[PDB]
Amino acid sequence: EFMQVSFAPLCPENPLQLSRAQQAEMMSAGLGRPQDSCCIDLRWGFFFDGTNNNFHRDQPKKAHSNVARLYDIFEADRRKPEFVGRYAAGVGTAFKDEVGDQGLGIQEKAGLAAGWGGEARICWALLKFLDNLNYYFERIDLGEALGQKDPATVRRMAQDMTIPSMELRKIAGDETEMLRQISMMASLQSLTATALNLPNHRGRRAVLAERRAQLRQRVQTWQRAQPKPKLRSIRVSVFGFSRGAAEARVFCSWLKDACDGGGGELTLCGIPVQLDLLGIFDTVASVGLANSSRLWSGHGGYASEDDLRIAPYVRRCVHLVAAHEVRGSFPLDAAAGVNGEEVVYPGVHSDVGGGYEPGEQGKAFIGDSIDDSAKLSQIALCHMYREAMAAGVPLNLSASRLSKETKAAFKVDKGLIDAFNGYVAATGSIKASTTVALTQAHYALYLRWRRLRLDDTAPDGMAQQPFVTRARTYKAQDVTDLLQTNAELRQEWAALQQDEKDAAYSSEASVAHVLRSTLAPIAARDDIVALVWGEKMTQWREVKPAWNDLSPLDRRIVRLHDDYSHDSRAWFKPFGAASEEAWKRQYRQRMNRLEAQDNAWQQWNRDVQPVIDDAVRKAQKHPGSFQPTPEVRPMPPLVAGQDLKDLKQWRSNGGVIPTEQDGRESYGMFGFLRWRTIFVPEK
């Protein structure tokens, strides 16, 4: 039983069409068998969205993820209560009636920065697991039938919902986030005192055991009253993206807590439970601040190494991973130990899990029109759809309840199919056998694309390409992201070419200056700067051969990166404003303040000017008075420096808000000239 590694297969001409083998698998899964016989199989899907992915918030802009899209088409038919799908919002977004996560304020920042709220979402889905069986019998969830609101129940189950707001403030702070990145990058134990905030394992099990006892009495009552049809089995499938894939894995490990009292094969109220498919997109944990180990590795809180291991009763795991994701905040957690496939896909994190809005960064165009069907992540979506159908998951694209918009989310433009398959064909000779080697080989080709597009005065520069022209028509901030990030890559390379001349660390190294300038908590700790510097130079030497490879790149590879894949380092601004809307709000607030401060000074000037003129005319009339100057009211503070320049421009141009120019991960520590960090399971 093992995870076979490969690159993405060619996308079929109809990506929703099952292969002959997959159509056989679907039939043997039981989907389609009848209730005419004595028995029934319940089929339950659990869908955990990724960081800052929220289905109802993001579907209107067609930016809902591949997890949300598959959930949307899971059967929700009042005539089929045996099929139940449940959706957990991504961390950093609202999940309020479910767990009490408001998705604003410090709760939002802690969820985005550190995965806070993931434990609570797993606990909620474990309650839903019990609710699903009550719903079969009674058409109402069990907590609702008991008058028990889910947030209060989850708070008895989940440590993260008890963390005090002042502690959440610490977890989310800017400087704390710099320290987490340094700890991740340099394998450094925390320099500051931190809290572990481990899961409330005992409370979670205790709550599930009492909830399960309430469930068992009802199930036994209804089975006695009406034993037909017999409940033959419960078939579970679990899907996740990003931190939702870390949650999905830990949910599979903790599913034992919701099933009948331990001892052999999983059952619920005597009914066999089987886990037919774990379908996960690019697993990223990066949770918490520390754990009980020497190396935190992003494996804090619920996301321990032990529980991230694919649970042994997972019958099939399909893990689609992003070949070209390289952000330091998004290390990959590889999956092994069960039957299935780990398949490397082109693009960055949300080119595989979904979630870009069509048109962002000038991608997902058909001619000059924005079109969701041309989004790269549509290919991986259909791959997971075919695997879910083959595993017996009751996704129903034909259901009459479905919206036009819901069904259009599974459309795939033939131009994207051709560009995707051209990429696969151009790289078919690579043939690496592990996920680390396969991703590094495809990232090496990406680096050669970046070098091709590096000189933004030249015809082959990124700035001169059609996708940047399209980005300009879509959103000014996207162009700034793209081109500022290319400028930062020129700086990254120049700093490394300078610093590689001397293998020994110096305080005057270029990269050292970058680190001190961008990482305030360690700017006075030259020894820590030296440690980060040493790892950065090691990473450069790893990728230098690819970056320096000036052999022509296959045209098919260039086209995919120009027109389909996104640049996730470019837009990700953990040290900028919380969002573009927040950036704009803060600029308007700053200008409003500067206007008030200037209107206060100008009004002082007009009150004082007559007094100063009057003292002049008098000294002219009596040049001998020692006319000492008159005292006036205290002068309000002067708008000066950059503040005055911005205010002047703001008045002149009528209120144009400049785009946000920086805020990305430091290129002195992460940047493009590195390999993505990938944790490969213990064996």
Residue numbers in the entry: 35 to 717
Quote the study that presented this structure, word for word.
Using biochemical, structural, and physiological analyses, we determined TleB as a phospholipase that mediates interspecies microbial competition in X. oryzae. Here, we demonstrate that the T6SS-secreted phospholipase TleB acts as a cross-kingdom dual-functional effector, mediating both interbacterial competition and host manipulation. T6SS effector TleB functions as a phospholipase with Ser240-Asp280-His347 catalytic triad. It hydrolyzes lecithin, exhibits toxicity to E. coli neutralized by immunity proteins TliA/TliB, and enhances bacterial competition against E. coli and P. syringae.
The structure adopts a shovel-like shape, with overall dimensions of ~120 × 58 × 65 Å. Structural analysis reveals two primary domains: a phospholipase catalytic module and a C-terminal domain. TleB demonstrated strong affinity for phosphatidylserine (PS), alongside phosphoinositides PI 3-monophosphate (PI3P), PI4P, PI5P, and PI (3, 5)P2, while exhibiting weaker interactions with other lipids like phosphatidic acid (PA) and PI (3,4,5)P3 and PI (4, 5)P2.
